[PDB]
């Protein structure tokens, strides 16, 4: 135990597999699905969420996120190293694979 294991195994004595790689995420809150088990919201058309229709994510991005580029305001106290280090640290922390 002079150095780290590559997989991060046996870091915690109580639960050696806790904190390692290729395991499930921790849910701080119970997951909500449109069927209750594994069906994402918006899978079946016409299913209302809490009495309200499920919005199209592309539509939300179109109305709310979209803004004309020509009035971009630069940050007066941050550099692009801020964004780069954020991305690098994120690539350290987590990566959720998906089937090919």
């Amino acid at each position: 135990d002079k150095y780290r294991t590559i997989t991060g195994m046996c870091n915690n004595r109580r639960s050696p597999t806790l904190g390692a790689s290729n395991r499930a995420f921790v849910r701080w809150l119970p997951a909500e699905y449109e069927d209750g088990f594994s069906l994402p919201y918006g899978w079946t058309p016409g299913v209302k969420r809490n009495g309200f229709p499920v919005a199209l994510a592309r539509a939300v991005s179109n109305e709310i996120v979209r803004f004309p580029t020509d009035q971009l305001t630069p940050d007066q106290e941050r550099s692009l190293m801020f964004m780069q280090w954020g991305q690098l640290l994120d690539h350290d922390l987590d990566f959720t694979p998906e089937p090919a």
């Binding site: 780290r4 904190g19 909500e32 088990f37 809490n50 939300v60 780069q84």
Partner: protein, 457 residues
């Protein structure tokens, strides 16, 4: 719409996608226990939930072995055997069945690089950071071998691995997090370190993978490269971001990583405003060349939040302890904006349904911070858990000697940047804060280096 596909349906009057039959590609995540129906779906973390410099050393043993240099006894890390930037090492190449780097430009014919992560070649800036880390590890190994010649290659590799891990931890927790959370949130969620605590779960939460995408709001729409005088380097001083995705050939054949680092150090970021969330380059032209159609990064964020089955905005507001709005007026009070609250209500219908990314990036930023109260709560909690649950924390007793701690506490990003490549003029103090040339730049012939003399065995 069949598994494992969860495409994004195109709404009417879409400014870019006129054909309503077309759908943005999207694949659901890998289940934790496939083949079950009585168990709730959970996702898999493919990487170690620790700040252990795992972007370059790999998280799986076969890949970790493949990354090292086995053709010597210096314990180095393999670099590219065919290309060098002014006599300096580059990332080793990778072979894949379908390589997007080749698809970006057939004439150049440079494949994607290989590192501890498969995403290390999305843009030249990430590749530059990876190459800088690799060069730093190699230089540390060389100086440790000169310092201690009796040492074996495995010992040198492990020692440089520990040094780089502690370096990443120090830089992050000392410079990056205070500039994200701000003084109040950083002091609340990351108090003074006490000691290791095994009763703390260091596993990455599900919401964090969606709550750490705030950086999508800091992306500038252009890539900037600067010469040795921090002037616009020709050719192509500024390049659209749609043409730099997976363009690994822009690293080998376009002057190396020095102009990219120089542009990063001396360019202001983008300020997140309630009416300017994200630029159109990543919203309508993301991965334009590789994919059949451009992607929508914010829409991908909300769709992935839905796919993971994360709760709504109000659930997280209650979880963190903040007041939960219910009506239009309460939402406008919380967001300190009335137009945005009206738009959110007209698109979702209730604050309980707003996605975590939308609520997180639509909140007003903290004082001297770049995230709202909810994102600050989530991020501070996650990083406190990561620090307090890591048994190999650089400040933990026994991991490093006292003199080693004093030597490590003096490291800095500008020292590494101007020590591992050809740039001489670097920013001072917090590199993440200095973005004006030449008002806040130095020659880095004044700032001290890393004193390895405490590593004598």
């Amino acid at each position: 719409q069949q598994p494992p596909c969860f495409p994004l349906k195109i709404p009417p009057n879409d400014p870019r996608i006129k054909n309503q039959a077309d759908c943005i590609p999207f694949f659901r995540s890998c289940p934790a226990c496939p083949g079950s129906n009585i168990t709730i779906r959970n996702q898999i973390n493919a990487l170690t939930s620790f700040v252990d410099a795992s972007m370059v050393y790999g998280s799986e043993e076969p890949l970790a072995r493949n990354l090292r240099n086995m053709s010597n006894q210096l314990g180095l890390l393999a670099v590219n055997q065919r290309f060098q930037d002014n006599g300096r090492a580059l990332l080793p190449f990778d072979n894949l069945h379908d390589d997007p780097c080749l698809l970006t430009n057939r004439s150049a014919r440079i494949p994607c690089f290989l590192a501890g992560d498969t995403r290390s070649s999305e843009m030249p800036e990430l590749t530059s950071m990876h190459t800088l880390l690799l060069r730093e590890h190699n230089r540390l190994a060389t100086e440790l071998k000169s310092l201690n010649p009796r040492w074996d290659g495995e010992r040198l590799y492990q020692e440089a691995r520990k040094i780089v891990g502690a370096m990443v931890q120090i830089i992050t927790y000392r410079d990056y997090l205070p500039l994200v959370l701000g003084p109040t949130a950083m002091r609340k969620y990351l108090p003074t370190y006490r000691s290791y605590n095994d009763s703390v779960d260091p596993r990455i939460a599900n919401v964090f993978t969606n709550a750490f995408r705030y950086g999508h709001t800091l992306i500038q729409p252009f890539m900037f490269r600067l010469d040795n005088r921090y002037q616009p380097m020709e050719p192509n001083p500024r390049v659209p971001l749609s043409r730099v995705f997976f363009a690994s050939w822009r690293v080998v054949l376009e002057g190396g990583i020095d102009p990219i680092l120089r542009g990063l150090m001396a360019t202001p970021a983008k300020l997140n405003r309630q009416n300017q969330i994200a630029v159109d380059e990543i919203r309508e032209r993301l991965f334009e060349q590789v994919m059949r159609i451009g992607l929508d990064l914010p829409a991908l964020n909300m769709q992935r939040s839905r796919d993971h089955g994360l709760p709504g905005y109000n659930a997280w507001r209650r979880f963190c302890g903040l007041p939960q709005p219910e009506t239009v007026g309460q939402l406008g009070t919380v967001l300190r904006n009335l137009k945005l609250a009206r738009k959110l209500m007209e698109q979702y219908g209730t604050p309980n349904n707003i996605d975590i990314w939308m609520g997180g990036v639509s909140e007003p930023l903290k004082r001297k911070g770049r995230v709202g109260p909810l994102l600050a709560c989530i991020i501070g909690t996650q990083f406190r858990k990561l620090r307090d649950g890591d048994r190999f924390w650089w400040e933990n007793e026994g991991v490093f000697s006292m003199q080693q701690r004093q030597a490590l506490a003096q490291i800095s990003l500008p020292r590494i940047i101007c020590d591992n490549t050809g740039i001489t003029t670097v920013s001072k103090n917090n590199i993440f804060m200095s973005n004006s040339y030449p008002r806040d730049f130095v020659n880095c012939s004044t700032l001290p280096a890393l004193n390895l003399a405490s590593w004598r065995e």
